[PDB]
């Protein structure tokens, strides 16, 4: 009802307490979904079905049905919540009398509270009230067993003082032992006691909401036995709970002014953010027969061009097949990629997109401005204050991807760590007393800049990149992201960038796959299909390898090695996995050969690069519709003409001659 004195005592009094209990029981038993569907019946049904112990009440529904309870809830939330828990337990037992042996207690989580208060606006006015706020979990302790119904051993006569409700305000200190009447020392009987999971989190105002030059305010929140592990550090959440004031914190130690450390007893947490029909449809997508091109076009939808880079990244994402003849000849199944390019070539954007898409993708930088680092250490954590073996960013992606930006600007220890990881897939610590060797089987996608900030094809990739040859060797794909002043490319890239800006202004040839579908496709392809190499032309590949070696030492260039054929095998397995074939087909082998060639050729100097390209154009032209080749030839001819003109101040014959080196109607149209 509504009369008498302050809400706290008004609802503490029995009469109103029983009245409100009956009212809430009636509300729970009688409530429609606005369509006649009894929402609470099904809610309790599923709750008891999954043994969840928590019933979520919508505050909007509660206010619409019984406005008195809605008005009283934000004024004396503790008593109202206890009453609601008792009533909900009664109703749940009535529905499922057998459910008493599972939980014997039901937590009523309020939801959709009307007023949302930001952490900076919490004052003494809001003390002992139900409030709704939003924030970012900064830190979160482990799940701690807190005393709930504590039994005590009297260590004078061994009697067991019975259960006392461990409140969240004060320690429960027994009086005398009922048998010996000795107020003497007591102990907690941990076998007879029952504990409730306890977690402490810190939530700070989100940086976006923080305005002007104001600092982000943080608050502590307490999660009790059902809200635990419902959030993780960094998660954006909305928290509803009691603005607690009185547990033990008043600064009575004379350390200063008599202020109270306030905490929030979380009552309801709502985060702000597996393949059955997925697996049904991804098989059809695989049979689509253009899935490889679809994926290659779906990678990095915000990055214009760089089709070769996107193809290499797709192959890396799908990975290869690790193997180990016996237990003595380990060979990695990871396709490592190194994008070496002059500034303004979206290498960072490629790495960030791979971070966004890939699962278990961790972004580290050659500088010291990264959350994680390449080298593993052991120290007491700054926040957790806990002695922790902080393994490196190579180990935090044991079965994932490590995105190493600024790969050319790494310390000596970082370079040694990356060498160890790439060559061994293990990281060895011998630090304090920890002598361990822990596995880091990551796929390394690295970004680097050339010496002098401008790639020069005159020199080779090894002496352009500013990296050690052993470090370079462990990369399957080496993308030379050169930048040139090409009219059409510049115009299209400018169009893309300006359009992105226009559409993202705050006041607001196959179709790419949706990103979530691509993610699930990757999950399935990596988890189930395991391509095998029984059917691959050993004769053809060996002939290619021998010819490549012959051409390598016919000129003064870097020789090809068994490393390259093994990387080609990995990429063939990756393509087979992309197409879910379960067997590498000759087209897969040809595509892997094309990638491996293109990379090895680009690693050479111009003098040998062009020679090898001409000699092995057969392989490089595979899966080329013969229009891209003609377009590139036309582009180089017009570039020669424009560089001639710009300094001094094309015919059909040159194009037809280079084509001969026959059908131009298709290219023209």
């Amino acid at each position: 009802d509504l009369k008498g004195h302050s809400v706290r005592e008004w609802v503490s009094m029995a009469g109103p307490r029983l009245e409100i209990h009956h009212r809430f029981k009636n509300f729970l038993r009688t409530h429609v979904d606005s369509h006649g569907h009894n929402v609470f019946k099904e809610r309790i049904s599923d709750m008891c079905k999954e043994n969840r112990e928590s019933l979520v009440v919508n505050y909007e529904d509660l206010a619409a049905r019984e406005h008195v309870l809605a008005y009283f809830l934000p004024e004396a939330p503790a008593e109202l919540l206890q009453i609601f828990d008792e009533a909900a337990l009664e109703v749940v037992l009535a529905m499922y009398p057998k459910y008493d042996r599972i939980t014997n207690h039901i937590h009523v989580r309020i939801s959709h509270l009307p007023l949302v208060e930001e952490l900076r606006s919490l004052r003494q006015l809001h003390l002992n009230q139900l409030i709704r706020t939003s924030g970012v979990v900064t830190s979160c302790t482990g799940v701690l067993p807190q005393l709930s119904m504590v039994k005590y051993n009297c260590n004078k006569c061994n009697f067991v003082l019975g259960p006392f409700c461990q409140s969240q305000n004060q320690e429960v200190k027994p009086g005398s032992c009922p048998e010996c009447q000795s107020a003497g020392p007591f102990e907690v009987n941990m076998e007879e006691t029952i504990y409730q999971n306890y977690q402490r989190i810190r939530i700070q105002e989100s940086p976006g909401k923080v305005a002007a030059g104001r600092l982000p305010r943080s608050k502590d929140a307490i999660l009790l036995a059902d809200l635990v592990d419902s959030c993780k550090p960094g998660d954006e959440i909305e928290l509803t709970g009691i603005y607690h004031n009185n547990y033990d914190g008043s600064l009575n130690t004379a350390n200063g002014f008599p202020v109270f450390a306030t905490v929030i007893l979380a009552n309801h947490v709502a985060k702000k953010d597996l393949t059955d029909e997925d697996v049904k449809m991804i098989t059809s997508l695989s049979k689509d027969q253009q899935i490889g091109e679809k994926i290659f076009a779906s990678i990095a939808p915000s990055i214009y061009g760089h089709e070769d880079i996107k193809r290499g990244l797709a192959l890396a994402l799908f990975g290869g097949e690790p193997k180990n003849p016996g237990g003595k000849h380990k060979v990695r199944g990871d396709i490592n990629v190194l994008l070496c390019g002059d500034p303004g070539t979206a290498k960072s954007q490629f790495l960030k997109y791979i971070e966004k898409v890939s699962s278990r993708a961790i972004f580290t930088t050659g500088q010291g401005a990264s959350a994680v680092g390449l080298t593993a250490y052991v120290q007491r954590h700054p926040v957790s204050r806990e002695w922790t073996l902080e393994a490196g960013a190579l180990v935090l992606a044991d079965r994932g991807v490590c995105l190493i930006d600024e790969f050319d600007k790494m310390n000596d220890q970082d370079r040694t760590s990356i060498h160890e990881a790439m060559e061994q897939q293990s990281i060895s610590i011998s630090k304090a007393g920890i002598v361990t060797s822990l596995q880091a089987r990551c796929t390394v996608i690295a970004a680097a800049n050339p010496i002098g900030g401008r790639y020069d094809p005159s020199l080779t990739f090894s002496e352009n990149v500013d990296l050690t040859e052993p470090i370079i060797s462990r990369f399957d794909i080496l993308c030379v992201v050169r930048d040139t002043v090409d009219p059409v490319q510049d115009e299209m890239l400018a169009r893309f960038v300006v359009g992105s800006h226009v559409r993202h202004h705050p006041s607001n040839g196959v179709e790419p796959l949706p990103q979530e579908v691509l993610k699930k496709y990757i999950i399935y392809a990596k988890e189930r299909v395991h391509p095998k190499l029984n059917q691959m032309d050993q004769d053809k590949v060996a002939k290619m390898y021998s010819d490549l070696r012959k051409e390598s030492m016919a000129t003064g260039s870097i020789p090809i090695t068994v490393r390259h054929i093994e990387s080609m095998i990995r990429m063939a397995e990756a393509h087979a996995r992309i197409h879910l074939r379960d067997y590498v087909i000759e087209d897969d082998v040809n595509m892997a050969i094309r990638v491996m060639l293109e990379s090895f050729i680009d690693t050479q100097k111009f003098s040998v690069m062009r020679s090898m390209r001409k000699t092995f154009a057969r392989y490089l032209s595979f899966r080329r519709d013969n229009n891209e080749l003609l377009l590139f030839i036309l582009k180089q001819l017009v570039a020669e003409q424009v560089t001639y003109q710009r300094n001094r101040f094309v015919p059909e014959k040159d194009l037809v001659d280079k084509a001969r080196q026959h059908n131009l109607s298709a290219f023209y149209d």
């Binding site: 190499l533 691959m536 050993q538 060996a542 390898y545 012959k550 020789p559 090695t561 054929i565 093994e566």
Partner: protein, 49 residues
């Protein structure tokens, strides 16, 4: 030191001091000879593995 043996250099392709090189009981020089038959056999063996 040059990345490849470069038999012409003879001995400049190793920068190890005689003191260090005396320590090792055995020293092997592994030059990637490019006999075509060996190349084909090596490719086939790698694929067989």
């Amino acid at each position: 030191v040059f990345g490849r043996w470069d038999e012409t250099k003879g001995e400049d392709n190793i920068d190890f001091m005689p003191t260090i090189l005396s320590r090792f009981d055995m020293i092997f020089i592994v030059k990637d000879e490019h006999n075509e038959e060996r190349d084909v056999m090596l490719a086939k063996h790698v694929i067989t593995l």
